[PDB]
């Protein structure tokens, strides 16, 4: 189906000279890509956004999706906390930046425009136990320091 | 207080859940060990038992500290 591409840069909701995908109506400015594209060097062939890349690679299969994300989160055996988030970036297309909503309504003299203008009116275990014991020794010595200060102010 | 174990909620219906956080997630006593039943790894429980041990030694030391400091307060009052 020959759908229409969005005349606004889907990342910045503005019009210009933008690169559009052939499988979804999303169009993006040249600077919005991650990393951004050079307009002199346009890719030869059918160009798609990151979302379509993920959609065709995973082939819309939930089982393969869960398999790959499980393998990757296993690969994050040291950074597992941010694994779920980090698996979300490389699947979806980009957007521009706006500060959060509750931050906006803390101060009333700051205002927004429709354009976005804002104006004012293993070895790791050894190391961790070592840090444990060094801080514990420091704290017991500081407690004895408390006690010695007490004993000196009360004897003197 | 009472039980720490579910029954055998066997078959397909049971849902195994892998945590996203492995150091202070507590959640139950129905753990399942791997290389709603909450799976976990050996090194994780290693860390958690070290946490128990060191927090316990810290609070024991602090109890002795408050004991001795009340002792010193009641002595200096005399």
């Amino acid at each position: 189906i020959d759908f229409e591409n969005e005349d606004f840069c889907s990342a910045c909701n503005q019009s210009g000279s933008f690169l559009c995908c052939d499988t979804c109506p999303k169009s993006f400015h040249f600077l919005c890509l991650d990393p951004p594209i050079d307009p002199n060097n346009l890719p030869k062939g059918d160009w798609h956004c990151n979302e379509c890349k993920f959609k065709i690679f995973i082939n819309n299969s939930m089982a393969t999706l869960k398999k790959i994300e499980s393998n990757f989160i296993k690969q994050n055996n040291n950074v597992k906390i941010f694994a779920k988030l980090l698996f979300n970036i490389d699947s979806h297309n980009p957007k521009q930046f706006q500060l959060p909503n509750y931050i906006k309504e803390t101060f009333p003299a700051v205002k927004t425009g429709s354009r976005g203008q804002y104006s004012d009116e293993d070895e790791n275990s050894i190391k961790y136990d070592f840090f444990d014991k060094i801080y514990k020794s420091k704290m017991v010595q500081k407690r004895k320091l408390f006690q010695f200060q007490e004993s000196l102010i009360d004897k003197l | 207080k009472v039980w720490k174990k579910q029954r055998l909620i066997n078959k397909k219906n049971q849902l195994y859940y892998e945590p996203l956080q492995k150091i202070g997630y507590q959640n139950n006593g129905n753990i399942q060990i791997i290389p709603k039943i909450t799976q976990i790894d050996e090194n994780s429980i290693k860390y958690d038992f070290f946490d128990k041990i060191y927090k316990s030694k810290m609070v024991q030391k602090r109890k002795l500290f408050q004991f001795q400091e009340s002792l010193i307060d009641k002595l200096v009052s005399n």
């Binding site: 050894i126 136990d129 070592f130 | 720490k4 753990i31 429980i45």
Partner: peptide
């Protein structure tokens, strides 16, 4: 350090895998 040696000694001495699983289950319950 020496506690890593504690747990490795346990893994070797208790010997079988299932019994070490049971040890760890006790340790986690506590």
């Amino acid at each position: 350090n020496e506690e890593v040696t504690f747990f490795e000694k346990a893994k070797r001495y208790i010997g079988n895998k299932h019994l070490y699983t049971e040890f760890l289950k006790i340790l986690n319950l506590y």
